[PDB]
Symmetry: C2
């Protein structure tokens, strides 16, 4: 390869200082965009959970920006994600996407906000062409730990959805990842 | 291969209901056995940290047992580890080895007790021949999550040591893993 850029919904390359909604390929009740929601069982003072609505015949997603290593947004390269919105003074920190501690009930890690930019921690994701249609999100937590004999020595897993309190919570999964697209604003 | 068994310090295969000390190949202040210590900053009611002494000219390690998938203890197969000792009624749970949440200061996960047996969670380890001399411990957390294109789809990392409050705390590392041996009791 060369590095392959990630594309808008219209075809335009992704711009580090434009904001996009993550939208789902599914049409119907089988669809709904990514948004920032309050976690049913969080003790954070801010909304800190990454969900997606139950149907696309409702609100639009919360817009996000992407922050690559540098300098453009390519497929298959570590990058931060961050909801791009106004927030109360108390919540400015709870917008940068992050993957949380192991959750025993779901047997996986959930996506939340409260991460950090440009640090080898739990805030690094990847975009990749899906297998069905479009793109998938990947989570590469623990970049700062050698994954033995793994591609580029890194742990990576597919982003998908679990049902937490009847809402759709984004989480690391094994089957059925969330196929998505990126609609500029 | 066939499956290769793990050996005692005397040569005898490892027995699921015998207990061993994890001892270090280093001689001197360069040595010290694995033990169960109180974590300087834990809010657990029980000692819950996996350390190793600063010199071998001191106390002996806390003995452990091993619990394989089944039925014997081989190299390179998921297995639980558990300090095999008497405990107050309140602490019976804080003996089974486990790897903890990401620690931001050390940029890695630390070893603690409080795990569980026979469950695809944060309590699974592997034994493997080292590269220098003897054996190493491996940590395979998140067995219940597909590691993309990884050997057997699993995240694995080398067990080693960080210095937490001047004591030696076992942790996942990248270089210099802890070379160990197993001395029956």
């Amino acid at each position: 390869p060369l590095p392959k850029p990630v594309l808008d919904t219209n075809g335009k390359e992704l711009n580090p200082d434009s904001s996009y909604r993550i939208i789902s390929i599914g049409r119907g009740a089988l669809g709904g965009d990514v948004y920032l929601g309050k976690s049913p069982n969080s003790d954070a003072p801010c909304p800190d959970g990454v969900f997606r609505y139950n149907s696309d015949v409702g609100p639009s997603g919360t817009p996000v920006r992407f922050i690559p290593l540098s300098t453009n947004i390519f497929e298959d390269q570590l990058l931060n994600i961050q909801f791009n919105i106004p927030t109360v003074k108390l919540c400015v920190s709870y917008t940068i996407w992050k993957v949380g501690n192991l959750n025993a009930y779901f047997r996986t890690m959930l996506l939340e906000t409260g991460g950090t930019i440009g640090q080898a921690d739990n805030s690094y994701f990847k975009i990749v062409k899906s297998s069905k249609i479009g793109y998938n999100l990947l989570s590469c937590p623990f970049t700062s730990i050698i994954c033995l004999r793994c591609p580029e020595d890194q742990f990576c897993a597919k982003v998908g959805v679990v049902i937490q309190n009847g809402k759709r919570r984004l989480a690391l999964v094994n089957k059925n990842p969330l196929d998505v697209l990126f609609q500029e604003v």
